[PDB]
Symmetry: C5
Subunit: 256 residues, 5 copies
């Protein structure tokens, strides 16, 4: 039972923050990057290393202590540091003799969500015989059915650099108290197209005029921004990610 919005200057608040990407971080110098990608010798023997697997990012932001609950109404968001992908001089692979370095490009996933509780995930596997590595949280008791839909694979995005992007998507059968948005663009030569502006707002209210309601006075923000792959001079390839800005406006709502 959602009742009226509380008004007055005291009745609104704002959360502003950035979520850093979690791409694998193969050493102390390579934050924002994965380990170079290797290919298994057989389909059955797919065994990716942990630092080769991008993961979902999540932040739980505490809100002013308040029945009233904070209701998330609007979102401004964007990728931070888009211009960094213009570095084409840092030991990349030349496009042709005497040319500049190939820029970051190829398969991308750009995703963000705002909820009054953890994002709910459903597991789907490209290859059910993939061995996922220690330190990740992955679909357990995988069967061949996991390659299309196995409803045993349910989880909460409740830990950082744990949930690999390739294993998990938002569960469309749940997430009633979250709003999520994502685009996968696959293909080795796909160009990054990244828009920035401080003039665009997303409205988080549902068709009944109600936004995510924050349980325990916590706001859940989640993101993935795999921008593509950086190709080294040797030809080896690493995922490259960027941080995402969130600004969320909230208001006090009475509930029964």
């Amino acid at each position: 039972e959602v009742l009226e919005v509380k008004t007055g200057v005291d009745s609104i608040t704002e959360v502003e923050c950035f979520l850093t990407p979690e791409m694998g971080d193969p050493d102390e110098h390579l934050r924002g990057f994965s380990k170079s990608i290797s290919i298994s010798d057989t389909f059955e023997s797919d065994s990716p290393n942990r630092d080769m697997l991008p993961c979902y990012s999540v932040a739980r932001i505490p809100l002013p202590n308040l029945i009233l609950m904070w209701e998330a109404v609007t979102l401004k968001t964007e990728v931070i540091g888009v211009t960094s992908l213009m570095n084409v001089h840092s030991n990349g692979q030349a496009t042709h003799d005497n040319g500049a370095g190939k820029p970051v490009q190829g398969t991308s996933f750009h995703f963000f969500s705002v909820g009054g509780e953890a994002l709910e995930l459903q597991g789907v596997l490209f290859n059910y015989r993939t061995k996922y590595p220690d330190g990740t949280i992955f679909p357990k008791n995988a069967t061949v059915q996991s390659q299309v839909m196995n409803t045993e694979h349910k989880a909460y995005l409740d830990k950082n650099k744990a949930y690999p992007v390739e294993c998990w998507v938002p569960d469309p059968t749940r997430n009633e108290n979250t709003r999520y948005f994502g685009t996968l663009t696959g293909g080795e030569n796909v160009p990054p197209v990244l828009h920035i502006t401080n003039t665009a707002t997303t409205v988080l209210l549902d068709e009944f005029g109600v936004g995510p309601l924050c349980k325990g006075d916590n706001l859940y923000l989640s993101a993935v921004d795999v921008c593509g792959m950086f190709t080294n001079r040797s030809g080896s390839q690493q995922w490259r990610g960027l941080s995402r800005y969130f600004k969320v406006q909230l208001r006090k709502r009475r509930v029964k």
Copy 2:
């Protein structure tokens, strides 16, 4: 059917929520969601695809609470489930270049869904009328050369799962008054998958007179195809890859004469 007023009251609305799994061919016990690798006939007349090489339409007939009243489908939420699985570029695929990652799934895609109060109605069109379609599939019969453009003999109902090959059949635009259907074919061998997910998008199913699909016999028919492209193995062989599709439909009771 004269369509009359909508019922109101708590008893008068219901919701259907489910997923349709893809039917890409499943050539062995480990390859659900994939087809057999594609081979090419030496002539048009010798084209004889194996069944497990042919993606088919998916369909589910969903029973509704028993009810003259009929359930009317009013809105749809839908999306492709598992889009991020296509980021697996390390599972014995074909390197894009020396020391590179594996080619991701790409190329010819067909993304399609329908919601109706009866089975989707189909019209057959053949790329090559001399293609010999395999046992266990339901395909256009008595094909002639006119079947390559339009033969009105090829009518059917999407009334069985794992049966109707995608490449032979399309929604019949001369029929389907009681269904709403939506699809996109993006052809070309290097086409990138572009797959959007969100829980904030709704499609309204009402027609221009405010009437949605009316569920004959209290059954709702959901249909889908989501061929996302092809996976390329190290050897260079290629297999179709598909994903499941989520459907959430809202229905209301409607009186008819």
Copy 3:
């Protein structure tokens, strides 16, 4: 014609529903919907395409119930039929790479459709004015070098099937006041077909005064081209591939003076 009021009543509306088959050249009895394989001339002056290598505009003149009143075309639903046929990549096609699937139909496409109350009016434009067009086609006559940009002598009516080559003719934008036309040329050898289907989309045919095409002599004219791209067989030779188009047009009776 001064346009006056619309007639009302059950008897005042009618519908046309049909399909137009493509006319790609049909080089033999097995290849309806295809052109002859494409060959290239040695020089501009020796360009000499055979008839079965030239796609042509499709047209149907549909008689309407005999009626001063005139039938007025108000709305259109239209759709390319057989889009999924283009997923046959196993039928004598050139492999994309060693051990890969066959190439899908792709490259240059023209998708076009028109609805009118008289024949579509055409203007001739030639890529190369010295092209010798074949017997059995209707093509710009007395061509000059000016015909490569605009020669106002080249006027015609789309009044016959398998006759007017797509490459020679376009809708005349200086005329066609009693027709609504819509077309897209997408050029390039690797262009991917993007073909959308749905039964939920309507095009309104009314002009800015609220008047649709008015059907002279109680005839409705539908025209189409759907060259989807080229099919490449295993030898590398290429052929245009086209598909049928569905039309459904709603009409009403309009009084004129």
Copy 4:
């Protein structure tokens, strides 16, 4: 000009309908609508294009019915590229895309542009290379300096002559052109696919934010266009710009001014 009321009555409106042919270079008597094959200089400083290799802006000055204070005001535009299907000729001395394949279609860099004004389009010069030597018979930025590569305000002109103003040297001057409406798109890159739409159902409104269209001085309407569709590649691999004509239909009304 204080703009006052619009005149009404059967006599108060008129239409202009015409087409502008492209001016691509026309290297011989058989190649109207094409440029000369494109060649490339051996050094940056020695860039020296032939006249017949340079596409130019097209312009028409259209006399309107005599008014005299009343002026013709341009209110709406329908426009269309004429002959889009000609680009389906892939059998006329083209380079085959692969062994036994069809000819490569026209593709690559394009510029599609049109304007409607009550006076000549005003141009600003910008040079890719200020040391480019532009040929006799063209009108081009004079006294070019290195600043001409980004913005040299000396390079002002009117589009007042055909086969004269090379497309690559000139753009509409956004600091002027208040009595003109202009629209254009450059799509660059050697494999760019032409995407050419045609319909007789699309109208562009020419009124500004105050409800005032271009006012035609001396009762003349100015139409300008460029439609470089891409390049045609012949059997030898050499490449020529290909252009097409553009249709204009403009509706005008009588407006009183003080």
Copy 5:
């Protein structure tokens, strides 16, 4: 406190100008171009020369002297000289035997902002061990966190030919008194798509009907228009940039 707009003939003014691009200008003939791009031998040794680094452009425009403040209400903007990119004959690299020169293409960044004070920047680095050259203003005290987000890297776009595009982006946590817009399109074969028209206006008012308010009677305009790279006959590549036109309409606003 923002109060009423002033009316009357004299209560409005316009600013019209162009900002020239700053791509690096490696010699006296190459305004609008960068130095040819070279690639470091190792990731760690990335050290771009100054004239190889495009920078943000900025102009501070004095307004009629005026509490009342000038409020920016509308913008028209356009890239100037788009057709110059049709020069495919000036010692470029033929796309194939006997073919024309490859046009300007590949990675682009088109960006513009209008503010009543300097654009505020946040630093993000592709490679934190990049040695940025003397004469540029770059993120100082870089750590591996600077590859994703280091909140120490704050600056104002207060100088021309100084702030490298690849190091800096607008700071979404600040910039309340500016409206900014940008698009990064990455990839070496990306085609430039450049539209021009004098019929398009952007409204600069925020959700409360308030545009940027010009402190000290100064209007701040900023831009980047890296259109892509030109490829020379040898294969060497140089960034190519173009000027940007700005027209801004302002009105007088009373504030307390």
